[PDB]
């Protein structure tokens, strides 16, 4: 079987987390925990906590083995913008886009 | 009685995006940037069917010219006979007879020749 887990409405820029994510495609779950654990990016804190929950539902609701699941696929969609107004020389006011992400992971038993 | 757009504009838009499958970048996603490309296509295809005709008159001819050259005569002098001897047979398309059945091209040659001069 396959096991999802999506962290939606996550208040961090999508392009930004989009790296950390691909930094752990189809990788030994246990290796991923590793990979991000020493990865230098704020994005790590997220793709990891969604990773942890990803394996969770893999073992808790989908009687899969933790000692052998990998990051089947994992993508980060772009959730709704969060615009804030920004003063600026001579009265010009730039809208600015605090974006957000919908980080998703899915794992699968090793082999067969 | 007010008449909104509604279905109409979209329909006629996406009715065109289809014709736009394959076009590079915004050419094939942007309605507006697609139409132009099609306007171009229309003309291209049209002026290119008038092209395909010659595009073959040529190929055919070349092979003809090379072919009968290995027999000892120019393309010009080749037709000269085909018309002198009278044989309007070899339509340049079915002049591929320089490949298949070359011994059937040869009897055409000796026709042009000894019938010409």
């Amino acid at each position: 079987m396959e096991a999802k887990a999506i962290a939606r409405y996550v208040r961090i820029s999508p392009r930004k987390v989009r790296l950390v994510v691909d930094l752990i495609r189809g990788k030994s779950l246990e290796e991923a925990r590793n990979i991000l654990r020493y990865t230098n990016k704020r994005g790590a804190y997220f793709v990891a906590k969604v990773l942890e929950s990803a394996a969770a539902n893999a073992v808790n609701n989908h009687d899969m083995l933790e000692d052998r699941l990998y990051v089947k696929a994992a993508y980060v969609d772009e959730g709704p913008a969060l615009k804030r107004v920004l003063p600026r020389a001579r009265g010009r006011a730039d809208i600015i886009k605090k974006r957000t992400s919908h980080i998703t992971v899915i794992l699968g038993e090793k082999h067969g | 009685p007010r008449a909104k757009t509604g279905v109409v504009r979209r329909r006629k838009h996406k009715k065109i995006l289809k014709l736009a499958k394959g076009y590079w970048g915004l050419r094939s996603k942007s309605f507006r940037k697609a139409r132009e490309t099609l306007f171009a296509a229309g003309n291209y295809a049209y002026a290119h069917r008038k092209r395909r005709k010659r595009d073959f008159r040529r190929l055919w001819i070349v092979r003809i010219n090379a072919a009968c050259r290995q027999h000892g005569l120019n393309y010009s002098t080749f037709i000269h006979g085909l018309k002198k001897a009278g044989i309007e047979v070899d339509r340049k398309n079915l002049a591929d007879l320089a490949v298949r059945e070359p011994q059937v091209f040869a009897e055409l040659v000796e026709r042009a020749k000894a019938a010409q001069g």
Binding site: - | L59, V62, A66, N93, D96, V99, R100
Partner: protein, 137 residues
């Protein structure tokens, strides 16, 4: 529906040069560089006889060309127009004069550059005695 040929085997051709007028030898070299002589003809697949030329350093050329003919090569920097006549060409690497002649008469584009690796000019004579060598006149 016209014939559209398949796979072919190349036919390398042994060509002299001693006495042969430049362009005259240039043309034929190129017409053969494609297959305009083979009615198995196809203007895109590329199947011209691998032209091979020996004693290229021995090419007669008309009028006063030797002292007169001027090959122009331009770099990128200013005054980078290096002007080089035949006289200098022959005495150095002679095989190259009959090169630019033929390359400059070949279809200009992708397969054209294909129709250049086919060209095997030398000075000696002598050349890669290899496997094929059909001597043409």
């Amino acid at each position: 529906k016209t014939y559209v040929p398949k796979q072919v085997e190349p036919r390398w051709v042994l060509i002299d040069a001693e006495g042969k007028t430049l362009g005259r030898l240039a043309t034929k070299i190129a017409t053969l560089l494609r297959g305009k002589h083979r009615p198995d003809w196809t203007p895109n697949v590329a199947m011209g006889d691998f032209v091979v030329v020996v004693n290229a350093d021995k090419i007669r050329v008309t009028g006063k060309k030797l002292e007169q003919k001027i090959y122009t090569r331009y770099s990128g920097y200013p005054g980078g127009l290096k002007k080089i006549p035949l006289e200098k060409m022959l005495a150095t690497h002679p095989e190259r004069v009959l090169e630019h002649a033929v390359k400059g008469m070949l279809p200009k584009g992708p397969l054209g550059r294909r129709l250049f690796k086919r060209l095997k000019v030398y000075a000696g004579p002598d050349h890669p005695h290899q496997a094929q060598r059909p001597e043409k006149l």
